Amino acid sequence: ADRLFPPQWICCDIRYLDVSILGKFAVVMADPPWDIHMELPYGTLTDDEMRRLNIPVLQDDGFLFLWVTGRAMELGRECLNLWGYERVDEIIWVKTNQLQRIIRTGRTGHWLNHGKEHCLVGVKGNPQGFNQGLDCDVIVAEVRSTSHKPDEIYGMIERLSPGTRKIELFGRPHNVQPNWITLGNQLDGIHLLDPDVVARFKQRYPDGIISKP
Amino acid sequence: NDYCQHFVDTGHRPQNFIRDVLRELIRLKDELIAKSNTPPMYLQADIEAFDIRELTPKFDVILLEPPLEEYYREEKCWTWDDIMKLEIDEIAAPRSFIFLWCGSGEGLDLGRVCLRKWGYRRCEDICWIKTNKNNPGKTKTLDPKAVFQRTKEHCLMGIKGTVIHANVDIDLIITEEPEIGNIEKPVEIFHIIEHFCLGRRRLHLFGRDSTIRPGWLTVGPTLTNSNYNAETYASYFSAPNSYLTGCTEEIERL
Numbered sequence A: 001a002d003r004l005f006p007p008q009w010i011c012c013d014i015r016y017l018d019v020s021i022l023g024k025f026a027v028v029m030a031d032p033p034w035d036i037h038m039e040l041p042y043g044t045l046t047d048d049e050m051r052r053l054n055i056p057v058l059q060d061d062g063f064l065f066l067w068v069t070g071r072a073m074e075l076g077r078e079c080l081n082l083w084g085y086e087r088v089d090e091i092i093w094v095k096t097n098q099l100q101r102i103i104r105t106g107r108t109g110h111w112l113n114h115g116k117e118h119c120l121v122g123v124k125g126n127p128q129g130f131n132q133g134l135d136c137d138v139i140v141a142e143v144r145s146t147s148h149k150p151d152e153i154y155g156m157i158e159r160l161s162p163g164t165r166k167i168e169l170f171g172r173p174h175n176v177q178p179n180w181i182t183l184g185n186q187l188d189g190i191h192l193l194d195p196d197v198v199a200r201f202k203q204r205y206p207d208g209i210i211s212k213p
Numbered sequence B: 001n002d003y004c005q006h007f008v009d010t011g012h013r014p015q016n017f018i019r020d021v022l023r024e025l026i027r028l029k030d031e032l033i034a035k036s037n038t039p040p041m042y043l044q045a046d047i048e049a050f051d052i053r054e055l056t057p058k059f060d061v062i063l064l065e066p067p068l069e070e071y072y073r074e075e076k077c078w079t080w081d082d083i084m085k086l087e088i089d090e091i092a093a094p095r096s097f098i099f100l101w102c103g104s105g106e107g108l109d110l111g112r113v114c115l116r117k118w119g120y121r122r123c124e125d126i127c128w129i130k131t132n133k134n135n136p137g138k139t140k141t142l143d144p145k146a147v148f149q150r151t152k153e154h155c156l157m158g159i160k161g162t163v164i165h166a167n168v169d170i171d172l173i174i175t176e177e178p179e180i181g182n183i184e185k186p187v188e189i190f191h192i193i194e195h196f197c198l199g200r201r202r203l204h205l206f207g208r209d210s211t212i213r214p215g216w217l218t219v220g221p222t223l224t225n226s227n228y229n230a231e232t233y234a235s236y237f238s239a240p241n242s243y244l245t246g247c248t249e250e251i252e253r254l
Ligand SMILES: C[C@@H](n1cc(-c2cncc(N3CCCC3)n2)nn1)n1ccc(N2CCC[C@@H](NCC3CC3)C2)cc1=O
Pocket: A012, A013, A014, A015, A031, A032, A033, A034, A042, A043, A044, A045, A067, A117, A148, A149, A169, A170, A171, A172, A183, A184, A185, A186
C-alpha cells in the first residue's frame, strides 16, 4: 500500500505492442478512440481491432476501467465480456466549468444534450484487498486541454487499490503517474524503471523497435 | 479542486456541489403540450397476469418502471427474467420510443438486452444523480459486486423505426435522494419525454395513483381506480388528430 514507483510509459501503436512483457496489474484503464461511426479528426480503432486487443494477458485478479461513448456503450460491454470481465459498476463524469456549472454538448445525431462521460467498471477473477465503497460513482470535475478525462479517476483508483501496479491504454503525456505504466502513440519514446519489465522488454525488443507483427 | 477526496473526507457527494440546480420558448411549448394532452387515463392491472395486447392503440412512447428488488433495501418485485418476458414489441408503434428505468446494477446490462429484444436501439442514457445535501452522514449497505457507492439510477431511451419542435434538455436529472422506502422516480423524466414531441399515445407501465398525469395512460397493479376504455382512448387519436406530435395547436372543429 506504501509503494509509489515512479511514472513509466511506452510510445506505441497499441494494436502492435506485445503487452505480455508488462506482467500483471491490479487495475487496467483504457480510453479508446472508439469507431463511433462518423468522420473524426483523430484515428480510431475498428471494432475488430478493439476486440483483438490482448487485454486478457494484463490481469489475473482485478478491475478494468473502460471509457465508453455513443455506440461504444454497447461495444465496450461486448469487449469487456469478450476479455473475460463482468461489468460491476458504471462511473459518470459530469463535465463542469470553473463555476461548477455543467458543460452541455449536442451531437446532430442525438435527442438530448450530453452532460457526462461514462466509464464501465469490470472485474476479472478474485480480487482481494481492494477498498470497495470509499468513493461514489459520480465525478464532478472541470474539462482540461491536456487530458481527455479528469485526474480525479486516478485518486479513486489509488484509494481503491493503493500501491499496486496499474496500466493505462490510450493515455496522453499529462496522464503519466506513479504506480502506472502508460501506453499511447502521442507519448515521447519509452521510459521503463521496473527491472522485471526492463529485462522482458530488452529480451522481446532488443533493437528497441515495435513494428507491425 | 477534488470533490471525490471531499466525499471520502466528509460524506458530501460531488453532485452536491453542482450549481444552478433565454427560454420564453418553453412557456409557449409546455403550453402546447398542456393543450394537446389527452385527459389522464389509468387502469389497475396485475401486469404478470394481464395480456398486454388489450392496451390499444399502439404507443408512440412507453415509460417502463418495473419494481426492481434494489429499490427496496431498507414478492411483488420484478426480476430481469420477468421483465425481459414482457411482450413490449406487441404494443409499440413501428416508429416509437421506450424509456426504461434500469436502476444501478445488472439492469444497466439486462435493460439493454430488453431494449434490443423488443426491437429498439439504445439512443440515450439518462442518469438520475441523487444529492445527499440534507443527510451527508448516512452510510448505505453496499451491493456485493459494487466497487463504488452507487448514487444514481439510469433510464435508457430506445428508438424503433427511422429518425416548433427542437431539443433543450440534457441527459441528467439532479434531485435530493428520497427518504427510505420512497421508490418514486423524479417527475422530471415526464418533462424530458414530453419535450421530445414524439406523439400523444403515451403509456406508463408500473405507474401508481401518484404518477397519473394528463397526456398519459397509466397501467399498474397498485392503482386504486380505473377509467380506461379502449374505444374512448382510441377516439382521442382519431382523424384529424392521428399524427399530432403533442406540441402543436389542437385541430379546430364545429
Ligand atoms: C491520446 C490518443 N491516443 C491514441 C492512441 C493510439 C494508440 N495506438 C493506436 C492508435 N490508433 C489510432 C488509429 C489506429 C491505431 N491510437 N494512443 N493515444 N487518443 C486517446 C483517446 C481518444 N479518444 C477520442 C476523444 C475522446 C476520448 N474519450 C474521452 C472520455 C474519457 C472521457 C477518447 C482519442 C485519441 O486520439
